[PDB]
Design an enzyme around this catalytic site. Sequence first.
Site, PDB file in Angstrom:
ATOM      1  N   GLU A  72      -4.159  -6.608  -1.587  1.00 27.76           N
ATOM      2  CA  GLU A  72      -5.435  -5.986  -1.276  1.00 27.76           C
ATOM      3  C   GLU A  72      -5.941  -5.250  -2.510  1.00 27.76           C
ATOM      4  O   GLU A  72      -5.299  -4.285  -2.945  1.00 27.76           O
ATOM      5  CB  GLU A  72      -5.287  -5.023  -0.112  1.00 27.76           C
ATOM      6  CG  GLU A  72      -6.576  -4.357   0.321  1.00 27.76           C
ATOM      7  CD  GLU A  72      -7.578  -5.347   0.881  1.00 27.76           C
ATOM      8  OE1 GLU A  72      -7.157  -6.410   1.385  1.00 27.76           O
ATOM      9  OE2 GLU A  72      -8.789  -5.057   0.830  1.00 27.76           O
ATOM     10  N   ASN A 113       8.696   7.818   8.773  1.00 24.17           N
ATOM     11  CA  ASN A 113       7.638   8.815   8.636  1.00 24.17           C
ATOM     12  C   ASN A 113       7.783   9.988   9.599  1.00 24.17           C
ATOM     13  O   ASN A 113       7.403  11.112   9.248  1.00 24.17           O
ATOM     14  CB  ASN A 113       6.273   8.159   8.837  1.00 24.17           C
ATOM     15  CG  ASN A 113       5.830   7.360   7.633  1.00 24.17           C
ATOM     16  OD1 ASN A 113       6.338   7.548   6.530  1.00 24.17           O
ATOM     17  ND2 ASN A 113       4.872   6.464   7.837  1.00 24.17           N
ATOM     18  N   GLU A 128      26.815   5.754 -10.702  1.00 21.90           N
ATOM     19  CA  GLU A 128      27.707   6.653  -9.977  1.00 21.90           C
ATOM     20  C   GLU A 128      27.219   6.877  -8.548  1.00 21.90           C
ATOM     21  O   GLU A 128      27.271   7.984  -8.016  1.00 21.90           O
ATOM     22  CB  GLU A 128      27.802   7.979 -10.725  1.00 21.90           C
ATOM     23  CG  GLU A 128      28.879   8.096 -11.803  1.00 21.90           C
ATOM     24  CD  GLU A 128      30.304   8.018 -11.289  1.00 21.90           C
ATOM     25  OE1 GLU A 128      31.213   8.294 -12.095  1.00 21.90           O
ATOM     26  OE2 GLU A 128      30.530   7.697 -10.105  1.00 21.90           O
ATOM     27  N   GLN A 175       0.822  -1.205   0.000  1.00 18.23           N
ATOM     28  CA  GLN A 175       0.000   0.000   0.000  1.00 18.23           C
ATOM     29  C   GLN A 175       0.858   1.257   0.000  1.00 18.23           C
ATOM     30  O   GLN A 175       0.583   2.206  -0.744  1.00 18.23           O
ATOM     31  CB  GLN A 175      -0.938  -0.007   1.205  1.00 18.23           C
ATOM     32  CG  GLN A 175      -1.910   1.157   1.241  1.00 18.23           C
ATOM     33  CD  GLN A 175      -2.940   1.016   2.342  1.00 18.23           C
ATOM     34  OE1 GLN A 175      -2.870   0.098   3.158  1.00 18.23           O
ATOM     35  NE2 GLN A 175      -3.907   1.924   2.366  1.00 18.23           N
TER      36      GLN A 175
HETATM   37  N1  LIG Z   1       5.180   7.309   4.543  1.00 20.64           N
HETATM   38  C1  LIG Z   1       4.173   6.515   4.191  1.00 20.64           C
HETATM   39  N2  LIG Z   1       4.036   5.274   4.778  1.00 20.64           N
HETATM   40  C2  LIG Z   1       3.011   4.461   4.425  1.00 20.64           C
HETATM   41  C3  LIG Z   1       2.094   4.871   3.469  1.00 20.64           C
HETATM   42  N3  LIG Z   1       1.189   3.883   3.308  1.00 20.64           N
HETATM   43  C4  LIG Z   1       1.513   2.861   4.131  1.00 20.64           C
HETATM   44  N4  LIG Z   1       2.634   3.208   4.838  1.00 20.64           N
HETATM   45  C5  LIG Z   1       3.321   2.371   5.834  1.00 20.64           C
HETATM   46  O1  LIG Z   1       2.773   1.069   5.811  1.00 20.64           O
HETATM   47  C6  LIG Z   1       2.549   0.589   7.117  1.00 20.64           C
HETATM   48  C7  LIG Z   1       1.328  -0.322   7.147  1.00 20.64           C
HETATM   49  O2  LIG Z   1       1.369  -1.261   6.092  1.00 20.64           O
HETATM   50  P1  LIG Z   1       0.608  -0.949   4.710  1.00 20.64           P
HETATM   51  O3  LIG Z   1       1.542  -0.306   3.715  1.00 20.64           O
HETATM   52  O4  LIG Z   1      -0.581  -0.062   4.983  1.00 20.64           O
HETATM   53  O5  LIG Z   1       0.097  -2.371   4.158  1.00 20.64           O
HETATM   54  P2  LIG Z   1       1.070  -3.363   3.348  1.00 20.64           P
HETATM   55  O6  LIG Z   1       2.499  -2.886   3.393  1.00 20.64           O
HETATM   56  O7  LIG Z   1       0.585  -3.488   1.926  1.00 20.64           O
HETATM   57  O8  LIG Z   1       0.922  -4.775   4.102  1.00 20.64           O
HETATM   58  P3  LIG Z   1      -0.536  -5.406   4.357  1.00 20.64           P
HETATM   59  O9  LIG Z   1      -1.224  -4.594   5.426  1.00 20.64           O
HETATM   60  O10 LIG Z   1      -0.397  -6.835   4.818  1.00 20.64           O
HETATM   61  O11 LIG Z   1      -1.343  -5.349   3.084  1.00 20.64           O
HETATM   62  C8  LIG Z   1       2.366   1.823   7.982  1.00 20.64           C
HETATM   63  O12 LIG Z   1       2.964   1.639   9.243  1.00 20.64           O
HETATM   64  C9  LIG Z   1       3.076   2.926   7.227  1.00 20.64           C
HETATM   65  O13 LIG Z   1       4.303   3.217   7.849  1.00 20.64           O
HETATM   66  C10 LIG Z   1       2.228   6.118   2.875  1.00 20.64           C
HETATM   67  O14 LIG Z   1       1.419   6.488   2.028  1.00 20.64           O
HETATM   68  N5  LIG Z   1       3.271   6.939   3.240  1.00 20.64           N
HETATM   69 MG   LIG Z   2      -1.429  -3.376   3.327  1.00 20.78          MG
END
Ligand SMILES: Nc1nc2c(ncn2[C@@H]2O[C@H](COP(=O)(O)OP(=O)(O)OP(=O)(O)O)[C@@H](O)[C@H]2O)c(=O)[nH]1
Ligand SMILES: [Mg+2]
Lengths: 51, 439, 433, 430, 95
Positions: free
Chosen positions: B71, B206, B254, B11
Amino acid sequence: RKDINKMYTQDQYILRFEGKLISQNKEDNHRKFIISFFCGDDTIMVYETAD
Amino acid sequence: MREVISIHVGQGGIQVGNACWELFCLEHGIQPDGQMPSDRTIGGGDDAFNTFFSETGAGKHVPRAVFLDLEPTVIDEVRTGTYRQLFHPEQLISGKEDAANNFARGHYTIGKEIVDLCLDRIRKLADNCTGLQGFLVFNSVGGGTGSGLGSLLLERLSVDYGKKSKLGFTIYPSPQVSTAVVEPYNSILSTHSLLEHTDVAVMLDNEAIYDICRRNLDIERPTYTNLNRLIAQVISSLTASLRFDGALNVDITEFQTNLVPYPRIHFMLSSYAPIISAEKAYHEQLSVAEITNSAFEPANMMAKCDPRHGKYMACSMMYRGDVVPKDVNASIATIKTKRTIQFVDWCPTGFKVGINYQPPTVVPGGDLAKVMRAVCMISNSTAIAEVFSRLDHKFDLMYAKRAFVHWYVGEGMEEGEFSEAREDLAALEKDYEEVGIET
Amino acid sequence: MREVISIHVGQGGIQVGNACWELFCLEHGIQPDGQMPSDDDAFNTFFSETGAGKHVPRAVFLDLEPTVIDEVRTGTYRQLFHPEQLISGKEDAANNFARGHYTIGKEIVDLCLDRIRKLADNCTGLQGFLVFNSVGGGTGSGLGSLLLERLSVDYGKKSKLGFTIYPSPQVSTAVVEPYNSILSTHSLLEHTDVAVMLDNEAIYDICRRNLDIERPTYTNLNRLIAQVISSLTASLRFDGALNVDITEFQTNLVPYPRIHFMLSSYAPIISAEKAYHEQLSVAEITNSAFEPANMMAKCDPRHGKYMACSMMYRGDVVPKDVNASIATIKTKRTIQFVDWCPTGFKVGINYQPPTVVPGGDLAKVMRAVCMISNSTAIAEVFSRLDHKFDLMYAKRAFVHWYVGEGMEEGEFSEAREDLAALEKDYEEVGIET
Amino acid sequence: MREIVHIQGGQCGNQIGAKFWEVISDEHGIDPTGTYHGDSDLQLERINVYYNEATGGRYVPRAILMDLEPGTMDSVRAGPFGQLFRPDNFVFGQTGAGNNWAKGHYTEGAELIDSVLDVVRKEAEGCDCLQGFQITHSLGGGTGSGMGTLLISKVREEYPDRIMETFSVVPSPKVSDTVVEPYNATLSVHQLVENADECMVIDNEALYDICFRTLKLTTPTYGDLNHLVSAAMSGVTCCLRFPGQLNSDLRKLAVNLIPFPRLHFFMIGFAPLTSRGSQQYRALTVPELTQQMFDAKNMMCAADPRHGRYLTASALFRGRMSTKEVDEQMLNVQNKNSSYFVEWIPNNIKSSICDIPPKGLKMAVTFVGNSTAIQEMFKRVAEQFTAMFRRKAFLHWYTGEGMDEMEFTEAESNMNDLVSEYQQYQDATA
Amino acid sequence: NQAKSHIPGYAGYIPGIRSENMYGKTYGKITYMSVTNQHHKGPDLPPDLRYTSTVKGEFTDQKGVKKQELLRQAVIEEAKITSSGYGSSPLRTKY
Ligand SMILES: Nc1nc2c(ncn2[C@@H]2O[C@H](COP(=O)(O)OP(=O)(O)OP(=O)(O)O)[C@@H](O)[C@H]2O)c(=O)[nH]1
Ligand SMILES: [Mg+2]
Ligand SMILES: Nc1nc2c(ncn2[C@@H]2O[C@H](COP(=O)(O)OP(=O)(O)OP(=O)(O)O)[C@@H](O)[C@H]2O)c(=O)[nH]1
Ligand SMILES: Nc1nc2c(ncn2[C@@H]2O[C@H](COP(=O)(O)OP(=O)(O)O)[C@@H](O)[C@H]2O)c(=O)[nH]1
Ligand SMILES: [Mg+2]
């Protein structure tokens, strides 16, 4: 100094032309060119296309 | 002639790739449909979009990217938004069942039936290009599917292609602020997986970007969109040297020649400057000296790590705009003679600089103001060991009582796999201070 | 190329900065928007050109009560000042020195130091720092002393000029001003380079006697101080026959490092109604400068000696008619100097006449003089304020307000001893061999 | 896609479903005739999670209602949105259990469960990619506590990988309406602990307390209680149906909230709740939502969390908002209430964001938390059970149909062991 | 007339700054949206406002936001431009 106020507001305007070269050489009277005029700071660029 | 393939998994990867591709389209003049406008009828010049896009022969341009997730909601959102006609329909690979914050699910059971499709699409995209510079991967490390698919994809790519460069922009959890509760496990496992399979890694936690946004852009309630826009700006500044003429060009290759001393030590930290809002941007000259002074400011870090606690090893900085090499050199001399910043003894000179002419592009509806000068800096420091140190503390503190271990064991992963990940982390930590001490 | 940096702390500091930065803008023609109204680096001392168009001042405003600052943000000069050099706190010190010096001044001084470093790095020929503060207040006296102490170790040899406002002998607002007056005196004595008395009762007298206003206000007072500042710093930016820098104060009015307390005066000061009934010769205005009733500090020069006097002339003066005026001053017997100072005049001349502010009070004149004098009579103010401190320290009044904020009980003692030593030094220097 | 089918038992379960389906149909804009009348596109893409398409453009819920007496079904069909249910899904007996766990679990249960198992198998095989099952029933009723537990055992045996979620209505000590509560409650809990993946406890005591002191309406009703329960239970799966910043499903919640397989009992709630006369003075902000939600008085159980420690927690935020307020408030409350949070697991709060607010509201919060304070329910009910079992009261009614006291004894031992091991983690230290 | 939004660090009150969110935007745009009421207000949502989830209701479009910004830039300046004359400003009676 550099004219800043002109650069900010006329940055997005770009003038594009299609041109042909005039010169003494005979082989180069047919190939065409594309001319770009950046009016942000009065910069002229020329690009040559290949068939 | 030069091409780069970006990989987005999870995501977070998808949500940051969306901002990156919007920025690239607006920078190259690409409309969401694909044609430049419908009004400019000359075209046929200055082929620089070839790095990120690919001409179809007549009209639209298709990006050289692939999206991975389990997802389907985010993929459907991308397929339904304003960029419906831009992306190729079948390069947005979407799974069926989410991994649900589990490393074992996305590494041993569910990732296997999607890795075949991902590799097939990767081969199809690679056959088109001829001068592939390298691969970029964006992965949310705190998510189960993100970590598992990133590990599997990196392992497969290390064999299928071999010597091709791969760059990793990972998002490790913040030291105190996090969303989930099981992130230490899969974070450690992913770190072990990518230690021996990633050429260059960059920290993108973040909380640091939060702090930058609050102080500079003066936003009290920012969201993930601002973070994605800032990260896309960083990526654009890094990659602009490829497709724009400049006084000094720096390529992807580089980096692993002038920024990484040893193969084991490639975990790095990034910084960007200047960040300022239009409501107070135009009161300052924004000179190169002050922007490069703000670049070295520890409060402007994109990773929650203070370099003042460690030594520097190599620094790569890229300037774009109307920057002057003599001013660049003067500022470099000033920051070198500054006492509060120190370098490691065995690296006397530690700067590689590239200059690009194109000023950064401003996106309407964004937060940043349009400026003339900018610097994006990547430095390798010993102080990055602290983020691994504190992450070790969290993992063991809950692993002592075997919490949540059944959720991983029941998915087909060996129970003893945590031990070797811990040993790998300890060895990586032990390495860093050995380099950090003087001869 | 050459620049001076002004520091304003305490709402007295901000309400003097408003007037002085209005006068500077009017003098250089800079609009309230910051744009030059269109038409030679004279503005470079006070303003910095940002690359295209507007100029941002080299000033920082510090205060803990946000009320006075919010007026500037909502005033007509909102677009002029930097948005992030108007530093504002949360809770005011509330007339407690210990609050603004040990508890609530610590979390805001670091941002001020960061801003000062950022501003000073831009300058290339920095001349020194100027400070405006209120000693008879909480955050004015407490925070300002902390900034002086921190600067004296962060930058070192850069000159520091002071324009402080000590309480009037009888006209006053608070009761506890003598307490935080002593401590700030102890802090500044060993950390500032030049001090100038700017009490409020004296200027009240000048306004009533000259400008013919029965009901003056602080804004009228601030304009005169702005005029004094501009006359003092004109030579650094406007061409003249004899130019003086702020290092000509650091070299000609301080015989000894301990003795650096002096006083200011200004003349002519007259309303427009009766402005055009005197010739206003250079001989006339220099006499009013030495007139004791024209003093901007509640001090009597006839009760002490003189050490050095630096007068700056701006206007249509000619150097030859100047020298006659000093000759007559020396001839006069009511004015006496110290034995070990045979010559005691440093004179600067500038070509730019003073400017008049619309809606102002003073009349447009072709000549003016600003005189900064070091004298032994300045020790009188320390005696009366010491007595006031002793009267209310005999019974340990209001002390618990200070001990509860992390300040030691004993700290009152040493600051008193420093004042006693200062009085001893001044009275010993005042004697003749 | 990744749909969940719905099964209910007993009159309590039927009345819960009658309101939950009404709420879901209102949310998705479905008229009582089963024809779509939505105002936005986003209300149709994920409608297959709860609805099955039929010829003629009408939608039918994939729910089956069962009981041992026909009166509750004849009442629930006639209610609003009652024509939505397929008549083939109604399976009912002709005798009834009469508040007897053994009667509903051994004699009539075996001979009646075949048809409902057949229909649920047909539904599960028909659905594209099953996500899991969800349960609404009451543990204090004989037919519910017996048939539902037996059906849970059967379906768990047939589909081990799929998730299981339950909404249990445990008997309350202060407001009790039958004496046979301890027996069937204890047996149902013993059967549930071995099969339920997730269990959520609901107390009529807590529902009455909330409706009396928060909304401050004089005369409550089972309709109001069902409305509260339905809103709370829809808030759990809303993010499965609508997009958001962070997607989260039942599997993710289970993974993040059950550290141990034998610890799967939570306690839920809903926020914000305000009276009609006080809704115009409150300000809807994230700090207000979290302040009201972490209040112990708001909880849908009589168990006070301040008597125990939060082993883990999860909050589901609903509506458009910023990650700032969510994450900052979670960290702030976690730091300010360190005495109420177990220490050997740092940062034990999970958060998710769904952009679609509920109809009639702009922001909402759904909280599911696992705390060691829930053990007092088991303690009290087991104390009553052993006190009334020592004298062999009502034992003949259970032993007259093949049940023996060995089962009662093993249920007592297993429940006591569960209570002891669940309490041990409260005093466990790092 | 005021000024239609303020400088960044202006302490004070900006009517409904905490009641109806207004997240993500810079601040000058936020306080511009407050002094001139372009926001829904109230604890309710008409169908048009809801069902607009981040990626759909923002992070989209091509130039509609651009023409909106220039309109806002024009409006803020024409409101502020009502000041001129070589008499400076009445700071004496404003203070
Ligand atoms: N900086 C930033 N971090 C994000 C963003 N979206 C998700 N994250 C990070 O992703 C973590 C949660 O996992 P997700 O990315 O939402 O979901 P996933 O990595 O696809 O794994 P699943 O939940 O099993 O589907 C959070 O703790 C965030 O740190 C984003 O748009 N910006
Ligand atoms: Mg996810
Ligand atoms: N001449 C003049 N004096 C001022 C002005 N403003 C404040 N003062 C003096 O300041 C004294 C009181 O201290 P303040 O400066 O007002 O307050 P402070 O220094 O910030 O200390 P706190 O009130 O505790 O915050 C009064 O007795 C005034 O004489 C001004 O604008 N002009
Ligand atoms: N929340 C709620 N609880 C109910 C409702 N109807 C009954 N109950 C509870 O269910 C318990 C009795 O259940 P019972 O009628 O024996 O269930 P059955 O045996 O399956 O028919 C009582 O303690 C009630 O509190 C309802 O509509 N809502
Ligand atoms: Mg004050």
